[PDB]
Amino acid sequence: MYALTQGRIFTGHEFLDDHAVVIADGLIKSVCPVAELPPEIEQRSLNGAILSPGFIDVQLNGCGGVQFNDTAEAVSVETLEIMQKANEKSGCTNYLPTLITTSDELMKQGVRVMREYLAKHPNQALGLHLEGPWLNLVKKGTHNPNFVRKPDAALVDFLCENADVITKVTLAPEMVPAEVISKLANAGIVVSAGHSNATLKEAKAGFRAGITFATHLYNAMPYITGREPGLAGAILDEADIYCGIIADGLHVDYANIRNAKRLKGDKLCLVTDATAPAGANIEQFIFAGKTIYYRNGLCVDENGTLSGSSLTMIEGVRNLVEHCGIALDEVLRMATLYPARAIGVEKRLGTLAAGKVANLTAFTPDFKITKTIVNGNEVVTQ
């Protein structure tokens, strides 16, 4: 047992000064004023850094130089181990390894690997985020067009049967029967609308069937016209729909993010949707059979096509703060509480409270990580 002290603490609901967070047995024992601590308890100074719950990234394809995609060799427990350690250096203690449209074979392999990972590393990579393959070719992005396909009943049932390791599935509502959505949803899986060219009507039909989330707002969605709001327009006007947004300033112009935050309120979650180069130092990487060069801090292919993100959660936090006029506290919620409630793990992860898992991170005013704690153990010290 020990307690973090001497620094601003963000519980997820407010900032506390002259307070302490007592951690013991991998959980947060309590939050109290530094005054109510028995002098003999081990005290670890924050050195004036802001303490926050660990960041939760609900959409991440890869980082730390690797990717949980494409090959059978990549889709492995070690990739998840490498990805986890990379995120931690960025204050991200939890994430959803995201596997994009590929073969049923690789999909089934992902499930086994995730399950294998869960049996070794607790409260870290929470579960699978299957992005695809039931998408719309027109908004396929970088996905392999050969794997974009209609949903097979058997594959659908397979997913429901394995909902215990599948946190979320992104599909194009106008490309799937309502039943599939309702099926996956009733199985306990978060169904999100994305890589879709759905009209407003199709989007709303997608929500009524059970979709409760939207993947990277504005990206791989119809443009917004006066007469046809499209899926993005629809997500904006639907109060209860949660949605992620990539805040690197490249995928979404900051004005669009500010507009989205005003309309989404407490339903907008920060995501990185990052790839291999994030939290690493590589020149390029392969994906969907294409070479994505990491040229000038940008992931672009030979055509000049922006083909990926290298954002990290602290960076996203920093950008939302200084470029989008969102106060730090609300931004912190966008990286913890909100995504936690969006995937249903707020019972134990989105905030700093008694009984919650001891996953935290600390950073200085200039947004530099100084600490990352996982299951009570300090894994990052800078």
Strand boundaries in 112-179, DSSP class E: 128-131, 166-171
Least distance (Å) from a second copy to the CB of residue 238? 9
Is 234 one of the binding residues for a second copy (CB under 8 A)?
Answer: yes
Say how far apart CA 382 and CA 368 lie, in whole Å.
9
Say how far apart CA 115 and CA 86 lie, in whole Å.
21
**DSSP labels, 4-67:** EESS-EE-SS-EESSEEEEEETTEEEEEEEGGGS-TTS-EEE-TTPEEEEPEEEEEE-EETTEE
Q: What angle do CA 64, 317, 300 make, to 5 degrees?
A: 50
Nearer to a second copy, 137 or 239 (CB): 239
Is 322 one of the binding residues for a second copy (CB under 8 A)?
Answer: no
Say how far apart CA 354 and CA 49 lie, in whole Å.
21
Is 267 one of the binding residues for a second copy (CB under 8 A)?
Answer: no
Least distance (Å) from a second copy to the CB of residue 306? 8
Nearer to a second copy, 35 or 227 (CB): 227
Q: Is 142 annotated as a binding residue?
A: yes
Q: Is 195 annotated as a binding residue?
A: yes
Q: Is 129 annotated as a binding residue?
A: no
Nearer to a second copy, 8 or 251 (CB): 251
Interface residue with a second copy, options 150, 262, 295, 347 (CB under 8 A): 262
- Binders of a second copy among residues 1 to 30 (CB under 8 A) are none
Is 32 one of the binding residues for a second copy (CB under 8 A)?
Answer: no
Assess whether the previous peptide bond of 133 is cis (omega < 30° from 0): yes
Q: Could you give the residue numbers annotated as active site?
A: 273
**All residues at 6 or more sequence positions from 377 whose CB lies less than 8 Å from its CB, including other chains:** 26
Interface residue with a second copy, options 34, 37, 74, 263 (CB under 8 A): 263
Residues near a second copy (CB under 8 A) are 200, 217-219, 221, 223-229, 232-234, 236-237, 250-253, 255-256, 258-259, 262-263, 306
